[PDB]
Each structure stands twice: as C-alpha cells, then as structure tokens.
Ligand SMILES: Nc1ncnc2c1ncn2[C@@H]1O[C@H](COP(=O)(O)OP(=O)(O)OP(=O)(O)O)[C@@H](O)[C@H]1O
Ligand SMILES: O=c1[nH]c(=O)c2nc[nH]c2[nH]1
C-alpha cells in the first residue's frame with residue numbers, strides 16, 4: 001500500500017498519456033515475449 | 049565434461065560452485081565442442097550424454113546445402129508424419145546428412161551507400177542550419193526590440209521554425225538526389 | 233491451405249520440441265525455458281552429432297550409454313529417444 | 329528583460345503544446361472546407377483559365393482566407409508537435425543509447441554493425457557535453473568510466489566519451505562553482521552544444537511523425553501556388569481514423585508476397601506477349617477503318633503494353649479486344665491461347681492479389 | 691400509412707411486399723447483415739468516394755481530351771469539362787463498369803500521355819474495382835455469415 005497523488009492521477013488521465021497507453025497495450029499484446037513482456041512494460045512505465 | 053556433468057547432477061551443492069567460477073574459461077572454451085543430449089536409459093530414466101563435436105563437422109553442418117536439406121526434411125516430417133514413423137524418418141535423414149557432410153568436406157578441399165548518403169545529407173544540411181544561425185544576430189534583434197514587442201518577438205521563432213522545416217525539405221531533396229545518384 | 237500448412241509447420245516448430253514433443257510452455261515456465269530445452273537439452277543437431285561421433289568412435293571405446301544406443305540403433309529400436317519426457321520432468325521434484 | 333522574453337516564449341510554447349490536438353482537428357476541418365469550395369470549379373475558354381464559378385460570388389476570398397488559415401494552423405501544429413512529442417522521442421532514444429553504452433558498451437567494446445543508421449547517428453551524441461538532458465541519469469558517463477576504464481583504457485574511454493579529467497576528483501571533493509546570468513549571451517552560445525542539437529535535429533528528422541507533418545506543411549505551401557494541392561490534405565482523415573489506417577496498412581502488410589505476385593502476373597503476360605508476337609499478329613489489328621491499320625502488336629513493347637493494359641482489365645481476357653478467329657487455321661490454337669489467358673491471368677493471380685490484400689485487412 | 695397511400699395510388703401496396711422479409715428469420719438475417727457492419731461499411735464507401743474524387747481531380751487536370759462521349763463528332767458531349775459532371779461520371783459508369791473507367795474512356799494510342807493514362811486506369815481498376823468493392827461485398831457477406 002502506497003500513496004497516489006491526485007495531481008499524478010490527473011496527469012495519468014490526460015489524453016496523450018491515454019493514447020500512449022493504448023498504443024503500448026496494443027503493441028505488447030500483438031507482439032510480446034514472456035520475458036520481454038515485463039521489460040517492455042517497465043520501459044513504457046519510465047516513458048510514461 | 050566431468051565438471052559439467054557434476055554441476056548438472058548436483059545443482060545445489062555450493063562447494064562445486066567454487067570450482068565452476070574458478071573454471072569459467074575452460075568451460076567457455078569447450079562450450080561449442082561439448083554436445084548434450086537426453087536418452088531413455090537402461091534404467092528407464094533420462095540420462096544426459098556428453099560427447100565431442102568437431103569444429104570441422106560443425107562447419108559442414110553450417111554449409112548451405114545441408115541447411116536446405118534440413119529445412120526440406122523438417123517441413124516434410126511435420127506436414128506428414130507418424131509418431132512411430134517420425135523417429136525413423138529422422139534417423140534416415142541423419143544418415144543422409146552424415147553422407148552429405150562427408151561429401152561436402154571432400155568437395156570443399158583446402159544499402160551501405162544509401163546509409164552513407166543519408167548520413168552525409170543529415171550532417172551537412174543541419175550544418176547549413178548551424179551556419180545560417182551562426183550569424184549571431186540576437187544582439188541586433190534585442191536592439192530592434194528595445195521595449196517589448198509581441199509581434200517582432202514571435203516572428204523571430206516563427207521564422208526559426210519555418211527555417212527548420214525548410215531544412216527538412218532540403219534534406220528530403222538531398223536524400224532523393226543521393227538515391228538518384230546511387231541508382232544512376 | 234498450402235500457405236496455412238506452412239504456417240502451421242512453423243507454428244508447431246515454435247510451440248513444441250521436435251524429439252520429446254512436450255509443449256513449449258512447460259519449459260517456458262522458467263525464462264528462456266523452451267530456448268534452453270531446444271538449444272542444449274534436446275537440440276536437433278545434437279543427436280546427429282552424437283550418431284556421427286558413435287560411427288567414428290571405435291566400438292571397444294564405447295561407454296555403457298554409447299554401446300546401448302549403438303546396439304538399439306543397429307537393432308532399429310528408437311525407444312532410446314525421449315517420448316514426452318525430459319531431464320527436468322524426470323527430476324523435477326529433486327531439481328526444484 | 330531576458331527573463332520576460334524567456335517567460336513569454338515558454339508560455340506560448342506551452343500554449344501550442346496544449347492545443348496540439350485541437351489544431352490538428354481544425355486543420356482537417358479547413359482541408360475539408362477548401363475541397364468543398366474547390367468542388368464548384370470551372371474552366372473558361374488558346375485561353376484556358378481555371379476559374380472559380382460562384383452563384384453567390386464571395387467564395388474566392390473565402391477560399392483564399394481558408395488557404396492562408398490552413399497554412400498558419402499547419403505551421404502551428406508542427407510547433408505543437410515539436411513542443412509536445414519530440415521530448416518523449418528524445419528521451420526514448422537517449423535512454424536506449426545510454427543503456428546500450430552501459431550494459432553492452434555498443435560504442436566502447438563492440439562497434440555498431442555500420443548498417444544501423446540510428447547507431448551511426450548516435451555515435452555523435454556519446455561525446456556531447458549536455459548528455460542525458462532528457463534522461464534522468466546524468467551520471468551514465470561516470471558509471472561507464474568505472475565499468476570499462478581499467479581494461480579498455482582510462483584515458484581512451486574518457487576521450488571517447490568526451491569527458492575531461494580535471495573535474496573527476498573535485499566533483500566529489502570541494503571546488504569552485506560558476507553561476508549564470510540571463511543577459512550574458514557568450515556563455516549561452518557556448519553552452520548551446522552544437523553537436524548536441526546537431527544530433528537532436530538528426531533524431532527529429534529521422535522521426536516518422538515529424539516527416540508526416542512536414543509533408544503536410546509542404547503540401548499546404550504548394551497549395552498556395554496551385555489550389556489543387558490542397559486535395560492531398562484530404563487523405564489525413566484516412567490517417568486519423570483507425571479502420572482507415574487498417575485498410576491502408578493492409579497493402580503494406582503482405583508487401584513481399586504482393587510484389588512477387590504482380591511480378592509473376594507480369595511474367596505470364598510477357599510470355600503471352602511473346603507467343604502472340606511470334607504467331608498471333610494478324611488478329612491484333614485495332615483500326616475501325618481498314619485503310620489505316622493500327623497494327624498494335626508490330627512492336628513487342630507496344631504489344632506487351634497492350635497485354636498489360638486493356639488485356640488484364642477486360643473481364644474476359646484479351647480475346648474480347650482481339651478480333652474473332654473464325655475461319656483461320658490457327659483457330660484452335662488461338663482458342664487455347666486466350667482460354668488459358670482467361671484462366672491463368674483473370675481467374676487466377678488476380679483473385680490471388682485481391683485475396684492477399686483483403687485477407688491482410690481481415 | 692403505406693396502405694392508406696395505396697388507396698390513393700395502387701402502387702404503394704408494393705411496399706407491403708417487404709413484410710415477408712420481416713416475417714422470415716433468414717430474410718431478417720440478410721437485412722440486418724447490412725446494418726451490422728454499419729460504421730466500417732460507411733467508412734469504406736467514403737474511402738471509395740475519396741479515391742474516385744482524386745482520380746477525377748487527376749483526369750480533370752490532365753486527361754480531358756479522352757473524355758469526349760459523343761457518337762457524332764459535330765457536337766462533343768465533353769463530359770469532363772465540369773468537375774461535378776466528371777466526378778459524377780467517375781461515380782456512375784466508372785465504378786459499375788467491370789473493367790474500370792478505361793472501358794468507356796476512348797483509347798489512348800498515339801498520344802504522349804499514353805503510358806500515363808495506362809498507369810492511371812490500371813491503378814483505377816486495381817484500387818477501385820478489384821479493391822474496396824470486394825471489400826464492401828466481403829464486409830456485408832461476412833456480416834451475414
Ligand atoms: N528439437 C529441436 N531442436 C531444435 N530446435 C527446435 C526443436 N524443437 C523446436 N525447435 C525450435 O525450432 C527453432 C530452431 O530450429 P529451426 O530449424 O526450425 O529454426 P531456425 O532458427 O531457422 O534454425 P537454423 O539454426 O537452421 O537457422 C527454434 O525456434 C526452436 O525453439
Ligand atoms: O532513479 C530514477 N529511476 C528511474 O527509473 C527514473 N525514471 C525517471 N526518473 C527516474 N529516476
């Protein structure tokens with residue numbers, strides 16, 4: 001359990017972040033390895 | 049081989065690690081040559097067998113005709129194959145491939161331009177942008193805007209971005225010219 | 233149908249090992265499990281190299297396993313090949 | 329002064345970055361309006377004026393204002409993209425190169441393959457002073473020095489990374505510092521790393537979306553010279569919509585198979601052209617009046633062109649356009665020729681190309 | 691309403707004939723196969739209109755001498771003189787031709803735009819007839835299936 005700031009949640013809900021999330025979700029599901037999945041996810045996390 | 053066999057058959061004993069991390073280098077050198085398989089042992093268990101693979105034989109395996117034969121056989125057995133007949137077709141292919149590699153040793157007795165043109169255009173077209181920005185007219189522009197002027201003030205970066213786009217166009221034209229040069 | 237058969241051949245190659253026939257997921261439980269199994273544990277060319285090594289080696293210098301494989305090879309008995317089993321499955325409880 | 333100018337510049341850059349998408353949308357709206365205005369376009373009577381006809385009369389100024397507004401909003405959209413998405417691409421590239429340098433030493437131990445244009449372009453940024461500007465870890469050079477210094481040469485890797493030896497010890501220790509003044513411009517010009525923005529503009533140019541937007545720029549600026557270049561902006565709806573992009577990418581999807589299939593279609597038609605040119609030439613007269621025969625299979629290039637065009641897009645084969653063979657000793661041979669043409673070229677390889685594309689879409 | 695209008699004009703009783711398509715199950719399946727992929731179908735016919743409009747623009751700019759459609763040469767029909775008429779002639783007659791617009795458009799032999807017209811019309815046949823039309827048909831039939 002941790003603290004999520006409301007400003008950070010609004011930044012998450014901003015539209016460009018949503019579009020990036022949609023694109024990344026499509027990419028990893030369409031092409032993805034079991035080892036490479038969790039690495040692409042953390043790379044996307046840093047980019048986001 | 050003895051060290052690898054011990055490491056595999058005893059994967060938890062920490063004392064054998066000392067030997068392993070003392071002997072990476074021997075194991076790393078012998079890694080390509082060591083061959084590892086699993087078989088139905090006489091005691092009805094899986095047994096890992098270690099043998100020697102000669103580098104000349106590996107090169108014979110990597111020769112192109114053997115690769116093509118392997119591709120054809122792999123397609124054939126997978127497309128049509130019986131569980132009993134699979135393992136027989138595999139060994140027949142193995143014998144044929146052994147003969148083929150023996151024959152291969154006998155018979156064999158003992159983009160970049162397009163990349164470079166694009167790189168040159170990228171170098172000395174953005175170098176052109178740097179040359180025409182090296183005039184260093186910022187002090188003259190501050191003489192012009194001695195008190196704030198929103199219009200004179202925005203037109204500066206507007207022209208800058210317009211010039212960035214025009215340099216992009218010059219780059220596209222340079223890439224087209226380089227590709228035309230390469231093709232003819 | 234011909235193109236789909238080619239794709240199915242490639243798909244089966246990538247999803248199941250040639251010799252043992254165990255599904256790729258069982259090895260892929262650990263990272264690179266299928267790659268390790270199909271490159272070192274159950275490599276296709278390794279059996280070819282082993283058969284050649286047996287042919288070149290003198291029968292007098294054959295080990296127990298080598299003599300066993302040689303004997304059932306000239307008896308045309310392919311039971312020595314693993315069938316739905318591997319070293320990891322055989323000693324899974326002992327290994328991990 | 330300079331504080332005020334920087335503040336106003338940054339505020340307006342944020343304005344464009346915030347309003348990137350709305351302007352992206354209004355640009356397409358203006359592109360639609362311009363095409364709708366152009367739809368009522370005339371030619372006037374050699375005097376050939378491309379004249380805009382109006383029942384109302386005031387459409388021509390409206391079209392001029394719409395073209396000017398489209399170009400202005402398009403430039404503003406490029407500014408918005410440059411201030412909104414470019415930092416993310418730079419961050420991704422500068423993280424990838426940093427991790428390749430640290431984990432693998434792709435520019436220290438093992439050099440790139442020389443075919444990775446991104447790799448050769450990032451060879452230039454490894455010695456830039458202002459490195460991880462966007463990346464968070466501003467000590468990647470310090471870490472790669474500790475990792476690969478003693479084996480591959482302390483000084484050699486240092487000068488490969490373009491890092492000075494003087495600052496190392498007294499960075500951890502106590503030393504003098506240098507503040508900055510906004511009015512002082514020589515320091516600003518020195519701090520603007522010609523090599524760093526060199527590499528940055530290289531990356532931006534290699535980016536695909538910026539290329540798309542600059543093509544959009546170019547089409548607008550050419551639309552000023554000729555009003556009809558605004559019709560290429562109409563395809564931007566096919567880029568905006570998801571299923572339209574799916575349809576467009578359905579062609580590139582099976583690119584290799586599609587190219588090879590049309591090549592085989594060309595080859596088979598070339599064999600048919602060879603056969604017709606050798607034997608079946610009397611049947612290829614294509615003149616309504618017999619006085620001047622068109623005789624379009626006299627030249628092989630022309631006959632192959634007539635089997636490429638007209639022949640393939642006929643719906644029944646070449647025999648529809650070629651005259652009837654009744655009463656000739658090659659009657660049966662021509663029947664076989666054309667029936668095989670219909671089966672192999674029309675029924676087959678054309679349904680194959682169509683099936684490839686539609687199956688890729690599906 | 692259709693019945694009460696059928697009293698005024700006897701021919702309005704023919705719309706009641708579609709009620710069998712509402713009664714039968716598979717007929718309703720066929721009718722609903724069109725609405726099923728409504729969004730994709732509308733966007734595909736819109737793209738078909740767009741591509742044909744680009745072809746109309748190209749023909750109106752360059753390929754206009756070839757669009758005379760008069761049997762007697764004394765009074766040329768000249769149906770690509772106006773862009774609306776030429777787009778209408780590429781919408782109708784052009785799409786429903788079976789071989790493309792080049793069937794109705796006159797032969798280009800002996801002209802310096804011969805190769806350019808060949809490319810124009812061959813691309814029309816591939817992109818408009820072979821493609822997006824089989825696509826619309828496939829969308830509808832696949833929805834039914
Ligand atoms: N018994 C097996 N031996 C080798 N590869 C196997 C085996 N079973 C499955 N495979 C899979 O087949 C692939 C390697 O063999 P294959 O010849 O099919 O492909 P490849 O990578 O093109 O081979 P090559 O080394 O000839 O280039 C890998 O994806 C591997 O996981
Ligand atoms: O220490 C850090 N680790 C990270 O991954 C990171 N990403 C942004 N900023 C960061 N800082």
Ligand SMILES: [Ca+2]
Nearest residue numbers: 291292293294
């Ligand atoms: Ca012995």
Ligand SMILES: [Zn+2]
Nearest residue numbers: 249251252274
């Ligand atoms: Zn196996």
